[PDB]
Design a protein around this ligand. Structure first.
Ligand SMILES: *[C@@H]1O[C@H](CO)[C@@H](O)[C@H](O)[C@H]1NC(C)=O
Ligand SMILES: [Ca+2]
Length: 477
């Protein structure tokens, strides 16, 4: 698929080893602290697609598929897939090439896209950087294809961040010399060949900031699909520019104030407010970025607060903000693991309850989003923008006039009081009836143009014109 095709997508991010086993067990042991392969496979994913698609997701992003280092390191196995050694072979732990082909097929059949996580920055190796036997890596079987050995000590030195190695002497990550044309051509031919042999619709590019920019354009072109990269920095000035060399990047600029705004009933609505506008103007295209508040490199949201209402609100923001929504497997089951490895819990251990509170919130949010796009070709391109905010609230508006979705979020929490917010600025016609598609209730725009929104239980409210819902099966009553 193309970037344009992706704008309208909703991503469910999962770790192949931790989503679903071929047998389907929901009790098979997976101690995150052991950092060992727990059994997740590609076939396991196919068997649980109903579960995923049932939340309104239109795509999935799975971790890297290349063959990893074999050893169980002092830090566990390469179950996460970021320690590759043979790029022309697949991690047999997940299955065969036929399984991977069958996975994308099952998806394309459901009208869903398949996004694959790929690493061009490094290989993995069990041991000190001085003991690396380069012949092990394929095709890059020589030390020349790599940068001289050194560990990145000063992350403020970009050249270092790009020329030195990640990891340490326990588990080092041999750093490829992405300036040598032999490397680039190999990587460009590989990625193109990869997307082709597995019918991949888009790519999530790992450690994008550790590889020099002039490498990414050709990679993105060779991929022949949409590429969203991981530039691990919350500074929009440093992160957004990468979209000039790659179709999109993960929205880490929004991530931090987003998390802080809803992780407690005293979060800063201001910071989120302003980051939204800053990104909207400074970033090449906010509608091509990826929104999230939870992933495998940060404590899960629930680790900060177990408040279900706050969880609903942050999840609602992720789905309604500009760009592509990205939910990390387990988030919908209120998982609360902390920093890696604690945040790589197996999804199956939850029992895949399709009636959990966040599973429903997400379904409802994705439903209205998916519907709106189906009737408004300008939605995905309409820059979300905040129309209101107070110490515990923020409201935004997105979508062509007459068909806009107006989202009201609150960090008051589950014990939030009940009151009426007179929302101004929504832009709906006076007297028009609206449907709050999360709780499925209506509200009528006042004569003055303001919308009396009933606030309670610190719940998120999402408005859309009731008349526009004619036909759909959103809030059938
Ligand atoms: C594409 O398929 C051929 C054989 O079917 C295989 O040899 C080649 O390595 C595959 N490309 C990649 C990068 O997997
Ligand atoms: Ca590098």
């Amino acid at each position: 698929a193309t970037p344009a095709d992706w704008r309208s997508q909703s991503i469910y991010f999962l770790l192949t080893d931790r989503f679903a086993r071929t047998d389907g067990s929901t009790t098979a042991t997976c101690n995150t602290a052991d950092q060992k392969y727990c059994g997740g496979t590609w076939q396991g994913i196919i068997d649980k697609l109903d579960y995923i698609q049932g939340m309104g997701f239109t795509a999935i992003w799975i971790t890297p598929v290349t063959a990893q280092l074999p050893q169980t390191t002092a830090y566990g196995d390469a179950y996460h897939g970021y320690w590759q050694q043979d790029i022309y072979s697949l991690n047999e732990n997940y299955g065969t090439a036929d399984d991977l082909k069958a996975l994308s097929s099952a998806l394309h059949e459901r009208g869903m896209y398949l996004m694959v996580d790929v690493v061009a920055n490094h290989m993995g190796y069990d041991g000190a950087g001085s003991s690396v036997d380069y012949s092990v890596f394929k095709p890059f079987s020589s030390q020349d294809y790599f940068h001289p050995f050194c560990f990145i000590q000063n992350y403020e030195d970009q050249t270092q961040v790009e020329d030195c190695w990640l990891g340490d002497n326990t588990v080092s990550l041999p750093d490829l010399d992405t300036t040598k044309d032999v490397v680039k051509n190999e990587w460009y031919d590989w990625v193109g060949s990869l997307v082709s042999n597995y019918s991949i619709d888009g790519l999530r590019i790992d450690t994008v900031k550790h590889v020099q920019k002039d490498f990414w354009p050709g990679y993105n072109k060779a991929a022949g699909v949409y590429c969203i990269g991981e530039v691990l920095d919350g500074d929009p000035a440093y992160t957004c520019p990468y979209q000039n060399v790659m179709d999109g990047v993960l929205n880490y600029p929004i991530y931090y104030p987003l998390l802080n705004a809803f992780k407690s009933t005293s979060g800063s609505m201001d910071d989120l407010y302003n980051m939204i506008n800053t990104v909207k103007s400074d970033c090449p295209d906010s509608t091509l970025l990826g929104t999230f508040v939870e992933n495998h490199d940060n404590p899960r949201f629930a680790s900060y607060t177990n408040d279900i209402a706050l969880a609903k609100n942050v999840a609602a923001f992720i789905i309604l903000n500009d760009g592509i929504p990205i939910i990390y497997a387990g988030q919908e089951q209120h998982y609360a693991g902390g920093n890696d490895p604690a945040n790589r819990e197996a999804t199956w251990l939850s029992g895949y309850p399709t009636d959990s509170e966040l599973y429903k919130l997400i379904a409802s949010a994705n439903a209205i989003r998916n519907y709106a796009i189906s009737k408004d070709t300008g939605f995905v391109t309409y820059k979300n923008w905040p129309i209101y905010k107070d110490d515990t609230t923020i409201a935004m508006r997105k979508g062509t006039d007459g068909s806009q979705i107006v989202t009201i979020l609150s960090n008051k929490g589950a014990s939030g009081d009940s009151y009426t917010l007179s929302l101004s600025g929504a832009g709906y016609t006076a007297g028009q009836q609206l449907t709050e598609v999360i709780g499925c209730t209506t509200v009528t725009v006042g004569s003055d143009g303001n919308v009396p929104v009933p606030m309670a239980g610190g719940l998120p409210r999402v408005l859309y014109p009731t008349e526009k819902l004619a036909g759909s099966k959103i809030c059938s009553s």
